[PDB]
Amino acid sequence: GGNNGFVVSEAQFNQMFPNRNAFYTYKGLTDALSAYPAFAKTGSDEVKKREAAAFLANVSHQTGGLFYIKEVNEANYPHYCDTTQSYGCPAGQAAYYGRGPIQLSWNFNYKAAGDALGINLLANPYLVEQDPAVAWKTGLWYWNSQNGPGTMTPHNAIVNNAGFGETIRSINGALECNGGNPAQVQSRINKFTQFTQILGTTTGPNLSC
């Protein structure tokens, strides 16, 4: 007595992501969850479902519904080498473009994600476009550990009922929030709303930023 499996089913995932690249599978996602045991396991089932929807909606936004493994515009790749860092860009100046479900970008984020995961992603950032197990964990790392431009982790925003809006702020707040790009804030809210509906939960408060 007591099925406490992942609050998103394979069927629900497939409905959320009809045009996903083969790189991205339900099994890959579920396999990664262990790395972040509080993710989608904290609070009431309403909240767990809401957090799962929040994560996956942002994922969908970053990747075009999991169509893209990596960032398309090669000419902009060198942008992501922050020369001010002391550990530099050893995998190459053009090696730190967006990859995986959260489109992890910048040498400094590869360094931090890698340090957190026990993987040298500064040295081998290509792992995030090659190895789904790593890719998924990079997404969960961002979600569960990083503030980005905001003041709290996406995980804590949902768990503490601070709002979906704060997850947006942590992912691309400096440009999108505070009137920067209301259309794109709304796009994320739309996808989140759809996902909460698929899962049978509510959006919660403070959706915008």
Contact status, residue 12 vs residue 198, Cβ threshold 8 Å = yes
Q: How far is the CB of 89 from Cl ion (least distance, A)?
A: 7
Distance CA 92, CA 72 (A): 17
- Residues numbered 17 to 76 that lie near Cl ion (CB under 5 A) are 25-26, 36, 38, 60-61
Which two structure tokens, joined as six digits, stand for 33? Answer: 């969850």
92 part of the interface to Cl ion, by CB under 5 A? yes
Distance CA 128, CA 24 (A): 12
Q: Which of 8, 48, 191, 209 binds Cl ion (CB under 5 A)?
A: 191
Q: Which of 175, 190, 197, 205 binds Cl ion (CB under 5 A)?
A: 175
Q: How far is the CB of 32 from Cl ion (least distance, A)?
A: 8
Which two structure tokens, joined as six digits, stand for 110? Answer: 């590869």
151 versus 181: smaller Cβ distance to Cl ion = 181
106 part of the interface to Cl ion, by CB under 5 A? no
List gaps in the chain by the residue before each (C–N > 2.5 Å): none
From 153, 160, 158, 142, select the one nearest 195 (Cα to Cα): 158
The DSSP 8-state label assigned to residue 1 in this structure reads: -
- Residues numbered 127 to 166 that lie near Cl ion (CB under 5 A) are 133
3 versus 72: smaller Cβ distance to Cl ion = 72
Q: How far is the CB of 45 from Cl ion (least distance, A)?
A: 17
Q: How far is the CB of 18 from Cl ion (least distance, A)?
A: 11
